[PDB]
């Protein structure tokens, strides 16, 4: 959807780009920052 | 690009748009420039003369302002001034000459022939040789009520001049529009300075008023309303996260960690070259939702 | 990282609706008021043939 | 009416006001009377005494 | 006046009235035409002003024209203004006094005079000419703008003769029209003004502020020696009523606090009531907004008694909690004992609130002018009592 | 927007004539229609357009009815041969099909 | 009865957006009282004075 | 059912004339009304019902 060119694909790419860009940090986030910040919860 | 480079004729400025957007813009009888000054009055001359001054008055304030008065004065006229004295000399009122003006030269409809369900108009006019140019109108034969042979130049004076091609009316009053435009900047403060400068260095004639409008009028509203629901949303979200954990620490941690996923998401738009809009807003909201889901499912485990 | 994220935000641009490209196009020339009835047809034919 | 020390401004109208909601002939008179603030009328002088 | 039944949509009624109005426009005389009234009721007239002239420069005709052609169109642009109707002043007209002597002398009737008058006050334009590759569009004059134009009107002309002008038969002047309504300021002299009407069921304060700001901004473009003096406005009465209500409510809250401080020996339990009463009125106002029911002066004056009737449950709860917390002092989970002390009186207060709330249906019962006028009061009372019940439960 | 269009077709008059003959009365009468946010008038060579723009959130049928409410009162004041007509029930997205 | 004595409108002068009516009437001396109406001059279609 | 009646009067005009000039345009225009199921109509020597 980000690398496609059809009919009305501009809005689809605009809506999809944020998720594609964020899918590389949200896993890192929930895998590293959550446990660290949880161990530091006292 | 090839279409623009091929079609080249004098007197045309090409534009290539979509049909639907073109039709929507044609039906949109509003103001397109960012800022618009509406000068209303009782006649056209006073408001035009006032806009001629407001143009340079607004073009001087700090900030790019391509103040353009109007593109309406573009018509060309051939005025046939009827003289009541020279028309009375032959016993023909003004309407007696306007009849020849509209029928002999104008060629107005005088009936319709019926051919079943159709209806075809009827025209009544003079020949082409007698209504070709103003010099031909000055010799237009006219038959007075008393059956006297005269011309049109004997009861009127034909002159050539210029004028408007279209007349605008805002709220049933002659109005003049002035466009002030900028780019990549919010026009929230320049409006006040412009109004102050206009009220100080410009005088209003009896029966004339000025007003300001444009897209910014709506923005200042919309944005405001948003700032009333952005907090509320968070609240309605927090009260839920607490209910999920019965502790404030986890909710605060998730709400403070979501910004990392938001950062990861927004770091790609620059590389892609796209621009942020409401669509990107929904994208970021969905990304934050999925990130909060991940965080909750991780904290539970 | 959350702080360095502030670089592209200002550098990023804002638009209202990304222009959607349809299967057709519309050509519209900006012109002047003065025009006759035959010259208009001539110009239309010329532009269409071009 | 303006002679009373408490009235501040009177606006009289005889007839109609060019509106479909007003249908008063040329003989019916309606006069709106504004009264000074209660802190300036007089010692006492309630509304009943004013009328 | 076409009067419909009760409970009808005013716009539906106007549409139904118009559905047959077009059938009559063709039967009336030539020059007259029927017009529908505004969209306002007897409570429409909100603002009134007068155009005063502190000099001897502008006469009544000038003020009337200024009011009709400048202010009427400048104040009608307000969103929720029904109409701005002019009053007073003089309507300038062009009067032609005929002379029967000259009519008999020149032998001309009034019909030909009217035909000549109507045939000299228009503009006729022929179709655009075919110039060299460009279009020129004709425009002919003929309008009447001065008395000299009126004088040069030919009523009768003879071939190889002398035409008869209007000046030789009549006298043209400028005068006043037959006045149907005259307005006047204090004994000083006559004036001309306007009246603003509010649309059916809208906010009057907002529209009043808007028209006042508009007049303030427009006063600059007025002639020299012309002022706009206001003569009536509902904003003052509404503000007075709101201030009185706020003061009375504040006094009631202060009284509640004083009583709680006096009888409970200086304990801040009064706060429990200061925060529980306004929320009930909030719920009531939300329920009202959910079904329109604009707030009149009666609906506002009723809450002063609603809070007084609602404070009873709060006082009872506070007193019971105090009594039980003091009895405990003789002998985490303690607050559970206090919750029990509260729940042992909760249901009774809840049912009392419910019955006092449902005891107002007999006021929703009655309908008509008395029902429409008194409805909002009973409605807001019922909603406030229901909200108070919910709160007392929570 | 939620707007209503009124078109008046005059064959052979200049802009000022159709402005002070068929457009001025239409505008002066539509300025007092309930719920209209604004009224614009465009006088051209022969034709005259009147756009009555209502507020946001109004029923288009309600707006058309309100506009027609005051259209009949003006039909008796226009010239003899001309008559004002209301626009279609479509917006700028109305044009769907085109043939030759 | 309607024009000479009544003074009905017979037109309207335009001066921009305003419209001022036109009146056509006899003098005041010929329409003062009923005795003045009983002597109102009238010109018949065949130009007779009565 | 929901029925709307439109009566038009053409004094002294043969059925064909009134049908071509009155009944036909009305019947063709009333078929575009939102929610119009059917549009019947008959013209007589002096009247036209739709």
UniProtKB/Swiss-Prot annotation, chain B:
GO biological process: copper ion export; copper ion transmembrane transport; detoxification of copper ion; intracellular copper ion homeostasis; plasma membrane copper ion transport; response to copper ion; response to silver ion; response to toxic substance
Induction entry: Transcriptionally regulated by CusR in response to copper and silver ions.
Residues that span the membrane, as ranges: 225-245, 252-272, 282-301
Gene Ontology cellular-component annotations: membrane; plasma membrane
One function term, GO molecular function aspect: copper ion transmembrane transporter activity
Subcellular location, record wording: Cell inner membrane
Keyword terms: Cell inner membrane, Cell membrane, Copper, Copper transport, Ion transport, Membrane, Transmembrane, Transmembrane helix, Transport
Assembly with partners or alone: The cus efflux system is composed of CusA, CusB, CusC and CusF.
Other noteworthy facts: The cus system plays an important role in copper tolerance under anaerobic growth and, under extreme copper stress, in aerobic growth.
Function according to Swiss-Prot or TrEMBL: Part of a cation efflux system that mediates resistance to copper and silver.
Record-stated family: Belongs to the resistance-nodulation-cell division (RND) (TC 2.A.6) family.
Protein name: Cation efflux system protein CusA
Source organism: Escherichia coli (strain K12)
Gene: cusA
From Swiss-Prot, chain C:
Organism name: Escherichia coli (strain K12)
Subunit and interaction comment: The cus efflux system is composed of CusA, CusB, CusC and CusF.
Family of this protein: Belongs to the resistance-nodulation-cell division (RND) (TC 2.A.6) family.
Gene that encodes the chain: cusA
Effect of residue 28 to I: Loss of copper resistance
Induction profile: Transcriptionally regulated by CusR in response to copper and silver ions.
Misc note: The cus system plays an important role in copper tolerance under anaerobic growth and, under extreme copper stress, in aerobic growth.
Protein name: Cation efflux system protein CusA
Functional description taken from the UniProt entry: Part of a cation efflux system that mediates resistance to copper and silver.
Compartments where located: Cell inner membrane
């Amino acid at each position: 959807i980000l690398w496609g060119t059809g009919a009305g694909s501009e809005v689809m790419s605009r809506i999809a780009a944020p998720m594609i860009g964020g899918m590389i940090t949200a896993p890192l986030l929930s895998l590293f920052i959550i446990p660290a910040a949880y161990k530091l919860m006292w | 690009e090839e279409l623009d480079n091929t079609v080249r004729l004098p007197g045309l400025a090409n534009l290539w748009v979509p049909p639907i957007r073109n039709r929507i813009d044609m039906l949109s009888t509003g103001i397109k420039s960012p800022i618009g000054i509406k000068v209303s009055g009782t006649v056209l001359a006073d408001i035009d003369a006032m806009a001629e001054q407001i143009e340079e008055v607004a073009r001087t304030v700090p900030g790019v302002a391509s103040a353009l008065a109007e593109r309406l004065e573009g018509g060309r006229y051939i005025n046939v001034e009827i003289n009541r004295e020279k028309a009375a000399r032959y016993g023909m009122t003004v309407a007696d000459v306007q009849l020849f003006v509209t029928s002999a030269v104008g060629g107005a409809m005088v009936g319709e022939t019926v051919e079943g369900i159709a209806r075809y108009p009827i025209n009544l006019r003079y020949p082409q040789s007698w209504r070709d140019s103003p010099q031909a109108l000055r010799q237009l034969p006219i038959l007075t009520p008393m059956k006297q042979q005269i011309t049109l130049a004997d009861v009127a004076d034909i002159k050539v001049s210029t004028g408007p091609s279209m007349l605008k009316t805002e709220n049933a009053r002659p109005t003049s529009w002035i466009y002030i435009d900028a780019r990549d900047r919010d026009m929230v403060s320049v409006v006040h300075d412009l109004q102050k400068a206009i009220a100080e260095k410009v005088q209003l004639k009896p029966g004339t008023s000025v007003a300001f409008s444009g897209q910014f009028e709506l923005l200042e509203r919309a944005n405001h309303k948003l700032k009333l629901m952005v907090p509320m949303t968070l609240m309605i979200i927090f009260v839920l996260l607490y209910l999920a954990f019965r502790r404030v620490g986890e909710a605060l941690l998730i709400i403070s960690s979501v910004p990392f996923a938001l950062v990861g998401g927004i770091w790609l738009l620059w590389w892609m070259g796209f621009h942020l809009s409401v669509a990107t807003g929904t994208g970021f909201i969905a990304l934050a939702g999925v990130a909060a889901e991940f965080g909750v499912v991780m904290l539970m485990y | 990282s959350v702080l360095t994220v502030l670089w592209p935000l200002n550098k990023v641009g804002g638009e209202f609706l990304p222009q959607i490209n349809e299967g057709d196009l519309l050509y519209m020339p900006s012109t002047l008021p003065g025009i006759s009835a035959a010259e208009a047809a001539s110009m239309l034919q010329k532009t269409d043939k071009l | 009416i303006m002679s009373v020390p408490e009235v501040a401004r009177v606006f009289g109208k005889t007839g109609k006001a060019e509106t479909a909601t007003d249908s008063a002939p040329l003989e019916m008179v309606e006069t709106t009377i504004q009264l000074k603030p209660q802190e300036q009328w007089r010692p006492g002088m309630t509304m009943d005494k004013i009328i | 006046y076409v009067i419909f039944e009760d409970g009808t949509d005013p716009y539906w009624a106007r549409s139904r009235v118009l559905e047959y109005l077009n059938q009559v426009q063709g039967k009336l005389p030539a020059g007259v035409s029927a017009e529908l009234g505004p969209d306002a009721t007897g409570v429409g007239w909100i603002y009134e002003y007068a155009l005063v002239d502190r000099s001897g420069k502008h006469d009544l005709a000038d003020l009337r024209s200024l009011q009709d052609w400048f202010l009427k169109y400048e104040l009608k642009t307000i969103p929720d203004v029904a109409e701005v109707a002019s009053v007073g002043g003089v309507v300038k007209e062009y009067q032609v006094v005929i002379d029967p002597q000259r009519l008999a002398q020149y032998g001309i009737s009034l019909a030909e005079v009217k035909s000549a008058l109507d045939a000299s006050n228009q503009e006729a334009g022929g179709s655009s000419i075919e110039l060299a590759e460009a279009e020129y569009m004709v425009r002919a004059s003929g309008y009447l703008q001065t008395l000299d134009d009126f004088n040069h009107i030919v009523l009768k002309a003879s071939e190889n003769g002398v035409p008869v002008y209007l000046r030789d038969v009549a006298k043209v002047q400028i005068g006043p029209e037959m006045r149907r309504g005259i307005a006047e300021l204090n004994g000083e002299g006559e004036v001309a003004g306007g009246v603003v009407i509010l649309r059916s069921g809208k906010n009057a304060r907002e529209v009043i502020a808007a028209v006042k700001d508009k007049l303030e901004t427009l006063k600059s473009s007025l002639p020299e020696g012309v002022e706009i003096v206001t003569t009536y406005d509902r904003s003052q009465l509404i503000d007075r009523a709101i201030d009185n209500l706020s003061g009375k409510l504040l006094e009631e809250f202060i009284v509640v606090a004083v009583v709680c401080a006096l009888f409970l020996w200086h304990v801040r339990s009064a706060l429990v009531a200061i925060i529980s009463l306004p929320l009930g009125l909030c719920i009531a106002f939300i329920v009202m907004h959910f079904q329109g029911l604009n707030a009149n002066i009666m609906s506002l004056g009723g809450i002063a008694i609603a809070v007084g009737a609602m404070v009873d449950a709060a006082i009872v709860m506070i007193e019971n909690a105090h009594k039980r917390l003091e009895e405990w002092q003789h002998q985490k989970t303690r607050w559970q004992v206090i919750t029990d002390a509260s729940v042992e009186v909760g249901p009774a207060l809840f049912i009392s609130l419910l019955i006092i709330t449902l005891s107002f249906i007999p006021i929703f019962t009655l309908e008509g002018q008395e029902g429409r006028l008194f409805g909002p009061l009973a409605f807001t009372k019922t909603y406030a009592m229901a909200g108070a019940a919910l709160l007392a439960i929570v | 927007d939620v707007q209503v269009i009124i078109k008046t077709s005059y064959p052979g008059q200049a802009p000022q004539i159709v402005e002070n003959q068929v457009t001025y009365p239409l505008t002066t009468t539509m300025l007092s229609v309930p719920g209209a946010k604004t009224v614009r008038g465009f006088s051209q060579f022969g034709d005259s357009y009147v756009y009555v723009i209502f507020e946001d959130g109004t029923d288009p049928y309600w707006a058309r009815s309100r506009v027609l409410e005051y259209l009949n009162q003006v039909q008796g004041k226009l010239p003899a041969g001309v008559s004002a007509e209301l626009g279609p029930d479509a917006t700028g997205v109305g044009w769907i099909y085109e043939y030759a």
